[PDB]
Amino acid sequence: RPRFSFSIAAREGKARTGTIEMKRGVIRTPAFMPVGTAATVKALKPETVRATGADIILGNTYHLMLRPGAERIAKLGGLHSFMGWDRPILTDSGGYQVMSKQSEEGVTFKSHLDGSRHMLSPERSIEIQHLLGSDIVMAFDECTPYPATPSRAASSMERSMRWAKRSRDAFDSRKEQAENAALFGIQQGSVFENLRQQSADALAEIGFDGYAVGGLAVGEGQDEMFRVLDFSVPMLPDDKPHYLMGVGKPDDIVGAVERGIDMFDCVLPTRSGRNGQAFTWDGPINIRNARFSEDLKPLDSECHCAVCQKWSRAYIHHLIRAGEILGAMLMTEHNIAFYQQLMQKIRDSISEGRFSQFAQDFRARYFA
Amino acid sequence: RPRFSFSIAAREGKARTGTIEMKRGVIRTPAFMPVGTAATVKALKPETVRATGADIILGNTYHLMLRPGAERIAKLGGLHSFMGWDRPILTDSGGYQVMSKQSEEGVTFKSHLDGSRHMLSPERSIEIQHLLGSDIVMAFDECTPYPATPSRAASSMERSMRWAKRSRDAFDSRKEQAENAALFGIQQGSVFENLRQQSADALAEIGFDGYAVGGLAVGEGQDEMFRVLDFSVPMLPDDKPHYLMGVGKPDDIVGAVERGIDMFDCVLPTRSGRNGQAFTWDGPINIRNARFSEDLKPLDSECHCAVCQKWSRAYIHHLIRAGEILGAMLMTEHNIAFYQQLMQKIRDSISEGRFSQFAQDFRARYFA
Numbered sequence: 199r200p201r202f203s204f205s206i207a208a209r210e211g212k213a214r215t216g217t218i219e220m221k222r223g224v225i226r227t228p229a230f231m232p233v234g235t236a237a238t239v240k241a242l243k244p245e246t247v248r249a250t251g252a253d254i255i256l257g258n259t260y261h262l263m264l265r266p267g268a269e270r271i272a273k274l275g276g277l278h279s280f281m282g283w284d285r286p287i288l289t290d291s292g293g294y295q296v297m298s299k300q301s302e303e304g305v306t307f308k309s310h311l312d313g314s315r316h317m318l319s320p321e322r323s324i325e326i327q328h329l330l331g332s333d334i335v336m337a338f339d340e341c342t343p344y345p346a347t348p349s350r351a352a353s354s355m356e357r358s359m360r361w362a363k364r365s366r367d368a369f370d371s372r373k374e375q376a377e378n379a380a381l382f383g384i385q386q387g388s389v390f391e392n393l394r395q396q397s398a399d400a401l402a403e404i405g406f407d408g409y410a411v412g413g414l415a416v417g418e419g420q421d422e423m424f425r426v427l428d429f430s431v432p433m434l435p436d437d438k439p440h441y442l443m444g445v446g447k448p449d450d451i452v453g454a455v456e457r458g459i460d461m462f463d464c465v466l467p468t469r470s471g472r473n474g475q476a477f478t479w480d481g482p483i484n485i486r487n488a489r490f491s492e493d494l495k496p497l498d499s500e501c502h503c504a505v506c507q508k509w510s511r512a513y514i515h516h517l518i519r520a521g522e523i524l525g526a527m528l529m530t531e532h533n534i535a536f537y538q539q540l541m542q543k544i545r546d547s548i549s550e551g552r553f554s555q556f557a558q559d560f561r562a563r564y565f566a
Numbered sequence: 567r568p569r570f571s572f573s574i575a576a577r578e579g580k581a582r583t584g585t586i587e588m589k590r591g592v593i594r595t596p597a598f599m600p601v602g603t604a605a606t607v608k609a610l611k612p613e614t615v616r617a618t619g620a621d622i623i624l625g626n627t628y629h630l631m632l633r634p635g636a637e638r639i640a641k642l643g644g645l646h647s648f649m650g651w652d653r654p655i656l657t658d659s660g661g662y663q664v665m666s667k668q669s670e671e672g673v674t675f676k677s678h679l680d681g682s683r684h685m686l687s688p689e690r691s692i693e694i695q696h697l698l699g700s701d702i703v704m705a706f707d708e709c710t711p712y713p714a715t716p717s718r719a720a721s722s723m724e725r726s727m728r729w730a731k732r733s734r735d736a737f738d739s740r741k742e743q744a745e746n747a748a749l750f751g752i753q754q755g756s757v758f759e760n761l762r763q764q765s766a767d768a769l770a771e772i773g774f775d776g777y778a779v780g781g782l783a784v785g786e787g788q789d790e791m792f793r794v795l796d797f798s799v800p801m802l803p804d805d806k807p808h809y810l811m812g813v814g815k816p817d818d819i820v821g822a823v824e825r826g827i828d829m830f831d832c833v834l835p836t837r838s839g840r841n842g843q844a845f846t847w848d849g850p851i852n853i854r855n856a857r858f859s860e861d862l863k864p865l866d867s868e869c870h871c872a873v874c875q876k877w878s879r880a881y882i883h884h885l886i887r888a889g890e891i892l893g894a895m896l897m898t899e900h901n902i903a904f905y906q907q908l909m910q911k912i913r914d915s916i917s918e919g920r921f922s923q924f925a926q927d928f929r930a931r932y933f934a
């Protein structure tokens with residue numbers, strides 16, 4: 199098994215489908231990564247996450263470094279062993295959650311759990327991700343708020359590129375990490391084409407295994423997100439994965455794939471599932487709504503997941519209204535399975551040269 | 567399949583092991599029933615409950631009648647269909663939770679959920695349990711607090727016996743219920759031998775498929791509970807199941823089986839699991855305790871359950887401390903599996919004529 203091999207099997211327009219081969223397994227792209235917060239995809243055993251079709255999950259470095267701590271996880275054998283997921287894991291850098299004292303060296307912050315003081319830097323972020331043992335490591339960057347002035351977007355992009363080089367050098371200095379994991383860089387530049395180009399050129403000069411489009415899905419809205427992707431994705435190396443972080447709704451994913459994105463993560467299916475929102479091919483529903491109290495159909499009548507083979511809307515409605523844990527379990531399994539079935543439909547349609555038609559048919563029905 | 571057939575395969579002292587054959591399946595005795603509150607055994611899918619070895623679960627009539635309502639459950643096909651458990655279900659009468667305007671006709675009360683007004687009577691309790699479709703129906707009685715004066719214990723026992731006859735007649739008047747379900751009566755009389763005898767004689771004169779020992783595990787403590795069981799269980803018909811409601815800790819169960827009890831339910835494994843208490847063969851542990859933060863052993867190193875094959879104390883410690891749903895899921899599955907493994911050990915030891923030795927060995931290790 200190679201450390202990292204991305205192969206593109208088929209293309210349609212800007213969309214691509216293929217595989218990332220890694221030591222812990224193969225990732226089919228375009229890929230959706232369930233978010234596994236503090237060493238758990240909330241309300242699901244790892245075997246259930248896998249049963250939905252997921253090939254890789256995301257772990258949040260910020261949360262893990264506070265509880266249980268990265269050093270403790272390493273002492274216990276790494277994140278895969280600790281949580282019982284043996285396939286690839288991508289970890290974020292920790293930086294975004296710190297935002298949600300700063301200087302050129304990094305950031306110090308007070309924990310939201312107990313006020314304890316912590317530090318993040320390019321070097322410490324890479325070290326934490328080494329201690330966790332993740333397979334895909336994210337460079338540490340400086341997030342740019344939206345809206346941002348051209349000057350602020352430029353300064354933050356520039357710092358992020360300096361931090362990308364430091365991330366690269368820290369990762370390369372760790373023999374076991376450099377030999378077995380992959381490192382992704384993050385493009386910045388807010389909504390400004392010139393800064394996006396400068397950022398892509400700097401990241402390509404440093405060299406990464408994959409490239410994220412950062413700084414989107416932060417309040418700009420879908421039209422603006424799509425407009426920035428239109429010019430930003432073609433600036434990245436074509437032969438490496440393109441990762442859109444923190445996206446998104448099903449229609450966000452489809453349009454992003456149409457613009458050349460290969461990888462996604464988001465909290466929406468898990469978080470909104472626990473809150474009572476179920477995804478269906480006819481759009482989302484809020485299962486708590488009284489119209490479902492006597493509806494014996496499954497959440498979606500075409501979904502292949504185990505929840506839709508076994509339980510009714512009426513039952514799940516009751517569980518969520520009652521605040522029952524099983525309600526969260528069933529809604530989350532369904533929503534993750536829906537997302538994986540969507541990614542499979544995307545991969546198949548690209549492989550068959552009918553993705554543009556799929557995207558049109560999907561949108562027509564989802565928005566009806 | 568018969569509506570109800572209890573067969574005793576083996577005895578040792580006062581302890582018995584056997585089977586209850588019902589239309590929806592066989593119940594191995596002595597039996598432990600997980601409690602499935604509002605149409606869910608909290609944090610477990612029905613397939614997981616079954617995988618632990620449970621043959622029957624309990625449903626709480628009081629909670630079900632308030633949310634989602636018994637009429638709604640019947641309209642949706644009954645409780646088995648609604649929650650996805652196709653094996654036997656025992657339902658309580660609803661009366662105890664009303665306690666936790668009263669007259670000879672029954673009780674009216676305000677819902678703890680929204681102040682709506684409801685009514686329970688012998689007839690309405692049996693009707694609710696018919697609407698749910700449960701396989702074992704509990705007669706509606708009047709609970710006696712502990713401590714109780716002889717006069718109050720007598721008056722409450724007498725009312726309970728009048729309500730037992732009304733429960734019997736209501737159940738017999740419902741053709742589909744009488745042909746396919748079983749009806750259990752409840753002995754009362756507080757700690758007083760004469761009232762316990764009067765209660766057993768009245769219940770046997772009415773005739774029931776099984777007999778519960780009511781009014782225990784309400785604050786009297788184990789020694790007193792055991793003393794009352796010593797004289798109360800031999801008063802019940804020997805050839806029918808003896809059910810001890812709301813019991814209990816592992817050592818309560820063992821000593822109750824030594825006194826002739828065949829069936830148990832309790833919230834302890836589920837509720838205390840969600841709160842961080844795990845049962846082990848060396849006694850209970852509180853997984854939140856810092857001594858477990860780096861303990862890579864499973865919850866119990868001899869337990870056969872899936873949780874103990876896959877996850878460490880250290881991981882479960884973290885999940886419970888973090889308030890993660892998966893922590894509740896894993897602790898609950900383990901504790902229910904522990905309880906079922908205990909019942910299996912009890913059944914096997916009785917069947918092999920070595921139950922007294924098992925009980926001694928169990929207590930010596932559990933309390934060390």
Ligand SMILES: CNCc1ccc(Oc2cccnc2)o1
Nearest residue numbers: 352355356357359360396397400
């Ligand atoms: C206006 N941006 C100029 C530009 C292109 C690439 C970078 O990134 C840099 C350059 C020098 C120092 N730090 C970051 O800046």
Ligand SMILES: CNCc1ccc(Oc2cccnc2)o1
Nearest residue numbers: 720723724725727728764765768
């Ligand atoms: C002191 N208890 C007398 C006794 C034995 C059985 C019952 O039960 C009764 C008898 C008459 C009316 N109601 C209940 O009472």
Ligand SMILES: [Zn+2]
Nearest residue numbers: 501503506532
């Ligand atoms: Zn589904």
Ligand SMILES: [Zn+2]
Nearest residue numbers: 869871874900
């Ligand atoms: Zn176990």
